[PDB]
Amino acid sequence: SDASTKKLSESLKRIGDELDSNMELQRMIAAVDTDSPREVFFRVAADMFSDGNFNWGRVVALFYFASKLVLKALSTK
Amino acid sequence: ASTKKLSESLKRIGDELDSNMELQRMIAAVDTDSPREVFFRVAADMFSDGNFNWGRVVALFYFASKLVLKALST
C-alpha cells in the first residue's frame, strides 16, 4: 500500500503547490473586478462544460480560484 | 483579463493538470476499500514538510470526495 500511497500524496503535493505558485492564477486573482458576482461564476463554470472536456483538473482549478478569491475578499469585509 | 480570458485561463491550467498527473489511476492504486485510513495517511504525508497552503487543502478536499465516491463502489 505504502509506495502507491506515497506516489499519490507526492502528486497531491505537486498539485497544490502548482496552484499556489501558478503566476497566471495569481495574476488573475489580482485583476478581476466585476459587478456581476454569482453571474461570472456561472459564466466561467459553463465554458468548462461548453467544449465537453470537463475533467478533474478544471474542477480543482475553478474551486481553487473561487475559494482563494472568497478568502481574500473575506480578508477585508 | 475578463470572463472569456478567465475561462480560457482556467481551462488551459486545468487541462495541463489533467494531462500531466494521471491522478485517477493514482487514487485507484491506494486501498479505496479503507478510506478513513488512507485519508489520514495522505493528509499526513502531505502536511509533513511544514508547507501548508490553500493549494494543498483544495487538493486534499478533491481527493477526499473522490475517495469516498470510489469507496462507495467495491
Question: What's the grid cell of residue A1?
Answer: 500500500
Asked if residue B17 belongs to a domain, the reply is no
Sign of the dihedral through C-alpha A57, B68, A16, A68: positive
Could you give the number of structural domains in chain A?
1
Asked if residue B59 belongs to a domain, the reply is yes
Asked if residue B9 belongs to a domain, the reply is no
Cβ neighbourhood burial of B16 (10 Å; 0-12, 13-18, 19+): middle
**Residue A45's CATH number:** 1.10.437.10
Experimental structure resolution, Å: 2.4
**Residue A25: CB atoms within 10 Å:** 20
Q: Which residues of A touch B60 (CB under 8 A)?
A: 12, 16
Asked if residue B58 belongs to a domain, the reply is yes
Asked if residue B10 belongs to a domain, the reply is no
Chain-chain contact of A9 with B66 (C-beta, under 8 angstroms): no
Range of the domain at B43: 24-74
**Method by which the coordinates were obtained:** X-ray
Asked if residue B29 belongs to a domain, the reply is yes
**Alpha-carbon distance B66 to nearest alpha carbon in chain A (angstroms):** 10
